[PDB]
Nucleic acid binder design. Structure first.
Ligand code: SF4
Lengths: 430, 552, 433
RNA sequence: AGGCGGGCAGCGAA
DNA sequence: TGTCCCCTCGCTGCCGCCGCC
């Protein structure tokens, strides 16, 4: 087929910015683009699955994945190449994940969630265009049932679109169109009562219905592709790639609470030193920055809350966004190879270079003089015998033993992790 | 004498043949060489005549240089291109001749080679050198090679930087040793005389005939002695001077706030000294780096009470130069060096091992790329070439050792007849081999999976995979699979890819038991230089294969 | 398309040949599908069998006799089995490997198909054109006759790269002959050329910059000469599998890129191999693989042997309706061969089911021009010989179409259409180059 | 804080 | 009037930019 025919067929296929993936793609693409596009969509899908397994909120999920859209598979672009990337990537993963039922379930779940997101950032005009591209009710029928439909959908609009004002809800309802469908296809909404039900028909919460239809059609197409796969088993090129891709699958703590006494009372000595140096200097150096950021990640501080806390502690935004935002997001494993970096344990902390002037990282039981450590203990109401005990532990090089002693006197005995210290201190209050 | 294209100064002429009369330039250069030779015979007052002979050498070198000066009234870019071309050719031929006699060339620089003679005495190496000289001088009518220096021990730091012990004979057959250095941090003007003296002592110790570990211990002892001397400021200030000459006016340096000589020049200009472009700025770092740099004359004034910073010197002026000096020396403990100089050992611990790798499961790796090229090209056959002149047939294996072809500087050369392959005479053969393989692939031979049938035919049934023997259940498959043909085409592509040839990732063309096994193996530096020198030929030979790899 | 060989697609096309010709024979001879049965199984009744002629042994001697042939049934007809042929009861025959045949016989014992008669495959229809089209073509010709010259490669000898005779030929066609369309076949830069094969490519003093690849050799050695061709003479190139300028080494072969050859759009066109095109009302069928030399017949009967071999080849091809019906293709032992892309034999069949008005398949045999089954067959031969002596080229002169002279036969029907009578109007002259 | 990639400037050497 | 001392390669330190562990 010619280039003009391909362009016309594609423009017909993506008259809306989203597609249902009904007709398989037509054209020739290289093995390079095949593998690259399949890997890109698999990366986005693995990220959605990792977000699911952590029970993250929907909003947090799109916040994480929007840059991955801008990087791997950009959406809402008039470029034909990106649209073909999306289409061929979806069908390549369709080919790859159809071998087993578990793979099919995972694929359809992730793809339907991706559809949910993609419909979410699409605008209301674009959403209407895609939906029009399942019978919509006429204007007279909507006007006749306007009161009941408004009563049914008012709560849903308020809770999903955040239209707290009644006038905004009424304006949205005036423009909102509805689809007449039977309750057998909308039973899940009927049970929760999100759809007005009349004479055996449910008046559509349309995203849930669209996603369910997507899941059903996708599962049927996956089964059909599994039926047709033995014919395509004859090619030497694709089989290793499909096999590789199949095996490739296989707040209480916020920016203001970490500053409070309630949370800081559960910190170890090192984290107190980092926190206090941050407060004094409004800035921390690299090893101290990474140490404190990883500890905060271990205690449950979110990426957004970490960014807010780090921005407010560094009392311009230009240099922050240029130089520290990427580091503070990458500690959380949101870019690069996306390493959810494990917080440093006491061995990792003690393996770092010894701090100098202005450097606050490390272990106070090793880097501080005995006088400063002793004074910090008197500030903790530690008696002289206890101070002598922890100093004896420090003098032998058993800094972790000294920290464990400090924990016991201030509050499985041995603690070799600041996050373990914090968790046990929180448990003692729980 | 040289016919050149005057419509494109980048086109390279060829040497005029023998019958053309000696021209103007060779005659003038011969006269100047005779004059400098007469000056040298006068040498054999000495220092003044040495100035004379080096000036005459500079005149001779300028006679070539202005063939590359744009504003020269006698600008001839093609001439300079051709002289440099021929010079590189003679260096390549000299190195290859060295390898022909089983000799180890350890370095070479634009007119010279350094040969490891493997000898424990002077005369044993001198005999080999004279034989080499006699063998090479025969190739040229007027070009002549000659022994320049003899090094008892040679330490190559990097390109253009090395130190050696020169053997200087005396009147009564007596031989003495002298330390000769070229281009190192010692010989620089940016480095203090203190650094020069301590580095001179270090090299004198290492290259001397002492136990290696004992040499390192002696050097270490010297080093902490200098550490104490520098820290206590028990050294005269004069040895702390740093020289840097500014090519531009100190106003026209954008990032001059970091480089210290600009600040020193600004202070001198404010004080009442004349500083302009080309001036040499001397200074001392006292106790940012640029803000603590002051001129000697200001520092020599005791009323200022300026004490040089032992930290900056002990790191950058001393530790780094010695660390560079002993990098390749056996059992060089950089951590111990820093400990002797009191530096942070964690900064040096990451250079020995390259620090911890660090990674998650990176699934961005297609199984196509993960397959080793050796296993890919294992089921391939070598490229066969015919010499256009002597008709000898040899397997081509890229820029690698062989008994039949040499990848000379000008191009591919045959060992039997010494003729040069023109690019067409190689691309045509490449294309012929590729098309013969393709035609064999399209011959459509079929082979049965069954071991007790194994029949090969070009007959196919309307059931393609059904064997044509009565009752045979074996799976019928193409004998020349397109996977094998893709492997062969990728092998032909690899044979002409500069990167793979430079890392020596090409499949060897001979097994160790083959009677045609190359007797002299190419050195890695030789392969890099050749693959850079024949980049056009390799890229064209690769484009010929890419003509058929794009379609496949 | 791509240099891929799929066994299953190959077998599918091989079966489809049998199926299509079975349908054609049933349609022409007004036979019901019930009359056709499996010839590989014993039957007490005479049946109709259609299949492909194949050797009785997969590893076969290079020479074949009427006692060493077999028939290949389709998947549906006989589960693809092959059965031996018993030709004792028929006296006149002409068979070759890869031929599709329509047959009448009986399998008396189970292990042999006893042959009683052969069903001759119907000759495909000839092209037709309306009165307005013929009048327009007559106006185009301005009364004068239609001139076309066909030339075939190689264009230079085996011991030099001189193309002076090409210069003389271009001078002639420009100043004296003045044709309407010129047809040139490949290979232009043959890859089996001896100096090219051995790499003995000499330095050319006649080029300012020496070429570095055979494609540049073509751009510097053929292209400026082809530019000397007059604008008023439209030219067409049909490549061969041996062209070094072609990256498609299979038959069928795609058309060369005219922009890659640097050759002007004003009068130059490049067609594929095989190809079919119209100049005025004329039909061409052009294939650049030597079927005449490669086709090796198994012949019985005095009458069949007494016939000209070229006529027999032409009838075989016209009946088979594909330009190179031999399967497997010929090989040259490896040096070259037919290089059949068996996955794409569909492109090799006659376009639209029409017998071409002029069928041109260059061959290494002696130049000839013959009329077979109202279809003219032309082979102008190689433009040069191996020794460099004068070769041959064919000039085709066709009288201007006229409805009044009666040389165009009207076809009865509601739509008035006229068959072209090429053999009545075309004079083919084979000129020494 | 560290390795890599491209850019500028200074400099020793053929 | 306004000039010059071959380019090119490799080596080291400094500075700003980008991605990463
Ligand atoms: S022992 Fe571990 S947790 Fe305690 S202060 Fe030292 S580094 Fe921190």
């Amino acid at each position: 087929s010619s280039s003009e025919e391909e362009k016309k067929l594609y423009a017909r296929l993506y008259e809306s910015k989203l597609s249902f993936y009904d007709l398989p793609p037509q054209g020739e693409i290289t093995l390079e683009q095949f593998e690259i596009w399949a890997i890109d969509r698999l990366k986005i899908l693995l990220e959605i699955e990792s977000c699911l397994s952590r029970n993250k909120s929907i909003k947090e999920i799109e916040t994480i994945i929007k840059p991955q859209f801008q990087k791997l598979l950009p959406f809402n672009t008039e470029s034909l190449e990106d649209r073909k990337k999306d289409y061929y990537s979806h069908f390549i993963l369709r080919l790859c994940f159809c071998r087993s039922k578990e793979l099919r379930e995972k694929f359809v779940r992730a793809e339907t969630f991706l559809f949910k997101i993609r419909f979410n950032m699409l605008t209301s005009t674009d959403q209407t265009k895609f939906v029009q591209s399942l019978q919509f009710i006429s204007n007279e029928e909507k006007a006749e049932l306007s009161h009941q439909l408004y009563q049914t959908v008012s709560a849903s609009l308020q809770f999903q679109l955040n239209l707290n004002e009644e006038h905004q809800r009424k304006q949205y309802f005036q423009q909102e169109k509805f689809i007449k469908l039977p309750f057998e296809n909308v039973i899940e909404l009927v049970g929760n009562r999100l759809v007005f039900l009349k004479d055996g028909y449910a008046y559509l919460q349309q995203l849930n219905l669209l996603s369910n239809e997507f899941a059903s059609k996708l599962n049927q197409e996956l089964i059909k592709t599994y039926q047709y796969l033995p014919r395509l088993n004859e090619d030497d090129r694709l089989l290793p790639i499909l096999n590789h891709l199949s095996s490739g699958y296989t707040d209480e703590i916020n920016a203001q609470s970490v500053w409070s006494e309630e949370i800081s009372s559960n910190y170890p000595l090192c984290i107190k030193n980092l926190m206090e140096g941050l407060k004094k200097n409004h800035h921390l150096r690299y090893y101290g920055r990474q140490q404190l950021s990883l500890f905060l990640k271990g205690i449950g501080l979110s990426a957004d809350e970490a960014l807010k806390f780090w921005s407010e502690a560094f009392t311009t935004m230009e240099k922050f966004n240029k130089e520290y935002r990427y580091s503070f997001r990458h500690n959380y494993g949101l870019e690069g190879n996306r390493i959810n970096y494990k917080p440093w344990d006491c061995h990792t902390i003690l393996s770092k270079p010894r701090p100098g002037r202005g450097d606050y990282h490390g272990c106070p039981f090793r880097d501080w003089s005995h006088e400063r450590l002793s004074a910090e203990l008197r500030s903790m109401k530690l008696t002289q015998a206890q101070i002598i005990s922890v100093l004896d532990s420090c003098q032998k090089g058993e800094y972790t033993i000294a920290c464990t002693k400090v924990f016991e006197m201030t509050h499985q005995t041995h603690i070799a992790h600041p996050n373990l210290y914090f968790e046990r201190s929180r448990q003692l209050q729980k | 004498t040289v016919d050149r294209n005057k419509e494109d100064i980048d086109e390279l002429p060829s040497v005029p043949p023998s019958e053309v009369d000696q021209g103007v330039l060779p005659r003038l250069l011969a006269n100047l060489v005779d004059r400098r030779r007469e000056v040298k015979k006068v040498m054999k007052k000495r220092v003044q005549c040495d100035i004379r002979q080096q000036a005459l050498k500079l005149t001779a070198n300028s006679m070539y240089g202005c063939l590359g000066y744009v504003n020269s009234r006698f600008y001839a870019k093609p001439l300079a291109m051709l002289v440099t071309n021929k010079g590189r050719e003679i260096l390549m031929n000299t190195r290859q001749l060295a390898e022909s006699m089983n000799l180890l060339v350890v370095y070479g620089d634009t007119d010279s080679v350094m040969i490891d003679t493997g000898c424990d005495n002077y005369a044993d190496a001198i005999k080999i050198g004279l034989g080499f000289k006699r063998l090479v001088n025969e190739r040229y009518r007027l070009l002549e090679i000659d022994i320049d220096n003899v090094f008892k021990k040679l330490l190559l730091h990097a390109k253009k930087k090395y130190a050696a012990l020169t053997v200087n004979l005396d009147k009564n057959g007596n031989g003495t040793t002298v330390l000769e250095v070229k281009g190192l941090d010692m010989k620089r003007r940016e480095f203090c005389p203190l650094s020069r003296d301590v580095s001179i002592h270090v090299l004198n110790t290492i290259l001397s005939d002492k136990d290696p570990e004992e040499a390192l211990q002696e050097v270490y002892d010297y080093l902490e002695d200098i550490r104490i001397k520098v820290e206590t400021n028990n050294i005269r200030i004069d040895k702390y001077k740093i020289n840097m000459k500014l090519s531009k006016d100190p106003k026209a340096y954008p990032g001059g706030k970091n480089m210290p000589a600009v600040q020193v020049a600004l202070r001198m200009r404010k004080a009442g000294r004349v500083v302009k472009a080309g001036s040499v700025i001397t200074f001392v770092i006292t106790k940012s780096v640029a803000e603590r740099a002051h001129a000697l004359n200001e520092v020599m004034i005791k009323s200022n009470n300026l004490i040089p910073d032992p930290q900056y010197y002990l790191e950058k002026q001393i530790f780094a130069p010695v660390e560079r000096l002993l990098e390749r020396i056996d059992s060089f403990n950089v951590v111990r060096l820093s400990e002797a100089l009191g530096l942070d050992s964690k900064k040096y611990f990451r250079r020995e091992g390259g620090n911890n790798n660090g990674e998650d499961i990176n699934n961005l790796q297609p199984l196509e790329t993960t397959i080793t090229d050796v296993e890919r090209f294992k089921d391939t056959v070598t490229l066969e070439l015919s010499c256009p002149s002597c008709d000898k047939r040899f397997p081509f294996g890229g820029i690698v050792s062989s008994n039949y072809y040499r990848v000379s500087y000008n191009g591919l050369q045959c060992k039997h007849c010494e003729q040069l392959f023109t690019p067409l005479q190689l691309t045509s053969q490449i294309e012929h081999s590729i098309r013969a393989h393709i035609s064999l692939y399209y011959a459509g031979w079929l082979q049965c999976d069954d071991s007790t049938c194994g029949i090969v035919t070009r007959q196919v049934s309307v059931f393609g995979k059904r064997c044509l023997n009565d009752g045979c259940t074996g799976v019928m498959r193409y004998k020349y699979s397109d996977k094998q043909l893709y492997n062969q085409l990728l092998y032909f592509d690899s044979l002409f890819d500069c990167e793979k040839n430079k890392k020596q990732e090409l499949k060897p063309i001979y097994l160790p038991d083959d009677l045609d096994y190359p007797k002299e193996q190419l050195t890695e530096s030789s392969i890099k230089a050749l693959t850079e020198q024949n980049r056009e030929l390799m890229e064209t030979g690769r484009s010929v294969v890419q003509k058929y790899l794009n379609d496949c | 398309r791509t240099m891929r060989q799929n066994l299953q697609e190959a077998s599918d096309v091989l079966d489809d040949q049998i199926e299509s010709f079975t349908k054609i024979i049933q349609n022409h001879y007004k036979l019901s599908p019930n009359d056709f049965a499996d010839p590989t199984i014993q039957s007490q009744s005479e049946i109709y069998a259609v299949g492909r002629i194949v050797p009785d042994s997969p590893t076969y001697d290079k020479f074949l006799n009427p006692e060493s042939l077999s028939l290949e049934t389709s998947r549906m007809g006989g589960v693809g089995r092959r059965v031996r042929l018993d030709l004792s009861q028929v006296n006149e025959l002409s068979f070759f490997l890869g031929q599709i045949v329509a047959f009448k016989g009986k399998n008396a014992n189970g292990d042999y198909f006893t042959v009683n008669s052969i069903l001759p495959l119907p000759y495909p229809n000839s092209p037709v054109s309306t009165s307005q089209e013929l009048q327009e073509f007559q106006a185009n010709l301005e009364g004068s006759s239609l001139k076309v010259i066909v030339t075939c490669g190689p264009y230079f000898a085996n011991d030099n790269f001189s193309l002076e005779l090409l210069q003389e030929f271009i001078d002639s066609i420009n100043n004296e002959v003045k044709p309407h369309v010129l047809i040139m076949f490949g290979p232009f830069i043959d890859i089996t050329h001896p100096l090219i094969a051995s790499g003995k490519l000499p330095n050319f003093p006649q080029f300012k910059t020496q070429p570095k690849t055979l494609d540049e050799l073509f751009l510097k050695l053929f292209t400026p000469i082809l530019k000397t061709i007059s604008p008023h003479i439209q030219t067409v190139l049909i490549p061969s599998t041996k062209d070094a300028i072609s990256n498609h080494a299979a038959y069928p072969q795609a058309s060369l890129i005219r922009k890659a050859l640097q050759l002007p759009k004003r009068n130059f066109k490049c067609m594929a191999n095989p190809s079919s095109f119209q100049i005025n009302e004329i039909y061409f069928g052009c294939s650049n693989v030597d079927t005449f030399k490669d086709l090796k017949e198994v012949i019985k009967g005095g009458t069949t042997s007494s016939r000209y071999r070229l006529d027999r080849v032409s009838e075989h091809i016209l009946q088979q309706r594909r330009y190179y019906p031999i399967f497997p293709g010929s090989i040259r032992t490896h040096i070259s061969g037919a290089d059949l892309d068996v996955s794409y034999l569909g492109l090799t069949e006659f376009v639209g089911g029409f017998s071409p008005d002029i069928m041109i398949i260059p061959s290494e045999l002696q130049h000839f021009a013959r009329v077979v089954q109202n279809v003219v067959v032309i082979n102008p031969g190689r433009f040069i010989r191996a020794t460099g002596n004068r070769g041959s080229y064919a000039q085709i002169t066709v009288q201007c179409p006229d409805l009044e002279d009666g040389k165009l036969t009207l076809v009865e029907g509601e739509e008035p259409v006229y068959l072209h009578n090429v053999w009545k109007r075309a004079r083919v002259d084979l000129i020494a180059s």
